[PDB]
Amino acid sequence: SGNLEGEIDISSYQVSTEAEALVTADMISGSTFPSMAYINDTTDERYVPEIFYMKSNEYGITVKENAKPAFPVDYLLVTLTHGFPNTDTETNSKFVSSTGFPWSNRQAMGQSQDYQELKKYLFNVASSGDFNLLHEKISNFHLLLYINSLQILSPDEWKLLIESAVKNEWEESLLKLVSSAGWQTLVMILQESG
Amino acid sequence: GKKRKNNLRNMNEVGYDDIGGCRKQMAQIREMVELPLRHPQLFKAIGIKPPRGVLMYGPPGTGKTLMARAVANETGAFFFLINGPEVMSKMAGESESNLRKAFEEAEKNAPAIIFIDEIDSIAPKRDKTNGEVERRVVSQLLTLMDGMKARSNVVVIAATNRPNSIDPALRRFGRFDREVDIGIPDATGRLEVLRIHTKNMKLADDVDLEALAAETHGY
Ligand SMILES: Nc1ncnc2c1ncn2[C@@H]1O[C@H](COP(=O)(O)OP(=O)(O)OP(=O)(O)O)[C@@H](O)[C@H]1O
């Protein structure tokens, strides 16, 4: 949403265990006031008792106020803290990716996964070698999902592909995959396709 | 005119002319309140520390509040009123805040007068102070009065029904040390009260206010 200074900061939250148990029995709904949540009625299926929200006043005394019409939702939240891994290169990530092959269903923009994009992204590396370059091009989450959806490779071929793309020891598995018949057919058709 | 003064001449419109039949106690309270505030130079010249607290008491309906308000208005000093009930009706932990405010505001606007009406309802006899809130409020009042010695040109007046209804700790040096007793008036006082009250009624020709004053005893 953005911080107090006008940036694109990010915040993480988590609803309490009673809000989780309140919504299951309906009993709550959004209100025209953004900060306050409404309360439903005692119909013939759902029975809602009187709801009190407890707060402490400036004099250190807990005060219970009936809130049938609406109550603030700040009593139904717990705040987490986000962050990023230190600049020290630990490289415990599962993918050197997120910049390349287009993501999931973004058809609204020009990001439309298709055979042409594969032919332009994952073909020059497969036409030259440099197994390291091929590995760093093959370790894209969305690329793996897309090739799986293509269903050209059989389940065992895809299992060895994922373990080649996500496991720290991939030389032998990468060689087996690139030598596999399924991968050979995939690359051949990809080259033939325009 | 009168009272710092038709222009020069509803509880801020009371003066010494709205009180009758209490010359002695009125003189006592005046000489105890006006002089420290109106003329603080006398005490500086003679090198004494005028007493601060004043404790009026008497049967209800004797005009204690009337006298306090009249003196406050005549002195022309910042007047702050404290009522025992309304202070004691606040939520727990807020009565002490109200007392602290009252006293800080009075100090910051010296000269000032603080009138604690019905003080026996917030600092009752120690036997009757059964409860954490009662003890806390009594202690806050005692602390405020003790810390007032540094404060100057501030006078505290308290009104109670009997001397034996307030906490005994309030009647010591540096606290409500001066005391005043209001009694029922005599025939002359009752006649003065009747003339004060019946100064707007459409009395008939055959009125004998002297006869009423003679007949009305214990009023
Ligand atoms: N000389 C007088 N003495 C007493 N009361 C008088 C006198 N002249 C008028 N009154 C009227 O008598 C009534 C006195 O009520 P007042 O509130 O002053 O008495 P109180 O019981 O001592 O006060 P409180 O409970 O506020 O401390 C008021 O109506 C006042 O106007």
Curated annotation (Swiss-Prot), chain A:
Localization in the cell: Cytoplasm, Perinuclear region; Endoplasmic reticulum membrane; Nucleus membrane
Role description: Substrate-recruiting cofactor of the CDC48-NPL4-UFD1 segregase. Assists CDC48 in the dislocation of misfolded, polyubiquitinated ERAD substrates that are subsequently delivered to the proteasome for degradation. Involved in the import of nuclear-targeted proteins into the nucleus and the export of poly(A) RNA out of the nucleus. Required for the proteasome-dependent processing/activation of MGA2 and SPT23 transcription factors leading to the subsequent expression of OLE1. Regulates ubiquitin-mediated mitochondria protein degradation.
Family to which the UniProt record says this protein belongs: Belongs to the NPL4 family.
Note, other: Present with 1050 molecules/cell in log phase SD medium.
Subunit organization: Component of the heterotrimeric CDC48-NPL4-UFD1 ATPase complex. The CDC48-NPL4-UFD1 ATPase complex interacts with the HRD1 ubiquitin ligase complex composed of the E3 ligase HRD1, its cofactors HRD3, USA1 and DER1, substrate recruiting factor YOS9 and CDC48-binding protein UBX2. Interaction between the complexes is mediated by interaction between CDC48-NPL4-UFD1 complex member CDC48 and HRD1 complex member UBX2. Forms a complex composed of CDC48, NPL4, UFD1, DOA1, SHP1 and deubiquitinase OTU1. Interacts with CDC48, UFD1 and VMS1.
Protein name: Nuclear protein localization protein 4
Organism lineage string: Eukaryota, Fungi, Dikarya, Ascomycota, Saccharomycotina
Gene: NPL4
Portion of the full-length sequence here: 387 to 580 of 580
Curated annotation (Swiss-Prot), chain B:
Subcellular location: Microsome; Endoplasmic reticulum; Cytoplasm
Phenotypic consequence of residue 64 to T: Probable loss of ATP binding. Complete loss of catalytic activity
UniProt cross-link Glycyl lysine isopeptide (Lys-Gly) (interchain with G-Cter in ubiquitin), position: 108, 125, 149
Other remarks on this protein: Present with 78400 molecules/cell in log phase SD medium.
Function: ATP-dependent chaperone which probably uses the energy provided by ATP hydrolysis to generate mechanical force to unfold substrate proteins, disassemble protein complexes, and disaggregate protein aggregates. By recruiting and promoting the degradation of ubiquitinated proteins, plays a role in the ubiquitin fusion degradation (UFD) pathway. Has a role in the endoplasmic reticulum-associated degradation (ERAD) pathway which mediates the cytoplasmic elimination of misfolded proteins exported from the ER.
Self-association and partners: Component of the heterotrimeric CDC48-NPL4-UFD1 ATPase complex. The CDC48-NPL4-UFD1 ATPase complex interacts with the HRD1 ubiquitin ligase complex composed of the E3 ligase HRD1, its cofactors HRD3, USA1 and DER1, substrate recruiting factor YOS9 and CDC48-binding protein UBX2. Interaction between the complexes is mediated by interaction between CDC48-NPL4-UFD1 complex member CDC48 and HRD1 complex member UBX2. Forms a complex composed of CDC48, NPL4, UFD1, UFD2 and SHP1.
Family assignment from sequence similarity: Belongs to the AAA ATPase family.
Descriptive protein name: Cell division control protein 48
The organism's taxonomic lineage, starting at the top: Eukaryota, Fungi, Dikarya, Ascomycota, Saccharomycotina
